[PDB]
Amino acid sequence: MKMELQQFLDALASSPEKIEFETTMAVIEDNYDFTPAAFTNGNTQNDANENNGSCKIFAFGLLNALDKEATLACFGRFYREDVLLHPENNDHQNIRNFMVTGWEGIQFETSALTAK
Amino acid sequence: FGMKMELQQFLDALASSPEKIEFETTMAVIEDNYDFTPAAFTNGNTQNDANENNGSCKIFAFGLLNALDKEATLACFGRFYREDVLLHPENNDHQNIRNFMVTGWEGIQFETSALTAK
Ligand SMILES: [K+]
Ligand code: NA
């Protein structure tokens, strides 16, 4: 995963419950050039350089035509544990907002990633 | 003059009656509502270099931005899909379309963002 895209993508397709935020970060960093971008995500607005981890997953899920579920898997434990196990909390508003509004709620002001 | 295609009406119209969607209509919506940036992308068994099959490039990116369904993204090709491709499965006309129908979003991968909302 960490350096090669397709294996990550296959793992994500095979065993989403098993990917970890740091493995998404690794893949994205090893395969894309990142440029900070503002983006909105349903209710939330991220300025450039803000919630970069989220910025990376959304932009990577856009390049990769990831469905809503696989995109949430990319957030690893912050999704599977912090957020999914706790509906009454307001922890990690990019995850919580994407769960509601999904890909329709995402909107980049500018392109965040380009393949190396 | 002063006539911009409204995105949401397109998408609702696309929702209720896909078969009435025309390709020029898609081209119009997208050109009025987004900045286009030539991007290479693969689509199952086709690869498009930057600026290659731009029509296709724009529709797929537009189906990504609007969280469109496979079938709905296909409706955007208008008659190229509805007539050229769907009436003639034996043929090899329009590989991006024929390709997407098989591999769907799973087969799509962009090198870089093709579209960005105005
Ligand atoms: K894909
Ligand atoms: Na959107």
The number of residues making up chain A comes to: 116
- Near ion ligand 2, which residues have CB within 5 Å? A 107; B 65
Radius of gyration of chain A (CA): 13
- Find out whether A98 and A68 touch, Cβ atoms under 8 Å: yes
Q: How many CB atoms lie within 10 A of CB A49?
A: 10
Cα end-to-end distance, chain A, whole Å? 16
Residues from chain B contacting residue A65 (CB–CB below 8 Å): 60, 64, 105-106, 108-110
For testing contact with chain B, the best of A33, A34, A63, A69 (most B CBs within 10 A): A63
CB count in 10 Å sphere of residue A116: 9
Q: Where would I find the H helices in B1-118?
A: 7-16, 23-33, 54-65, 70-75, 79, 95-103
Spatial separation of the C-alpha atoms in residues B96 and B75, rounded to whole Å? 13
CATH number at residue B35: 3.20.160.10
Q: Which residues contact B101 (CB under 8 A, 6 or more apart)?
A: B70, B74, B85
Number of domains in chain A: 1
The residue range of the domain holding A20 is 2-116
This structure was determined by X-ray
Total residues found in chain B within this entry? 118
What is the Cα–Cα distance from A46 to A14, expressed in whole angstroms? Answer: 31
CA distance A33 to chain B (A): 10
What Å resolution does this PDB entry report? 2.1
Any residues with CB less than 8 A from the CB of B88 and at least 6 apart, and which? none
Task: Dig out the tokens for B94 from the structure.
Answer: 């329009």
Question: Half-sphere exposure (CA, 13 Å, Cβ side) for B58?
Answer: 21
B66 CA to centre of ligand 2 in angstroms: 5
DSSP type of residue A109? S
CA–CA gap between residue A29 and residue A32 (Å, rounded) = 6
Of A45, A69, A47, the C-alpha closest to A57 is: A69
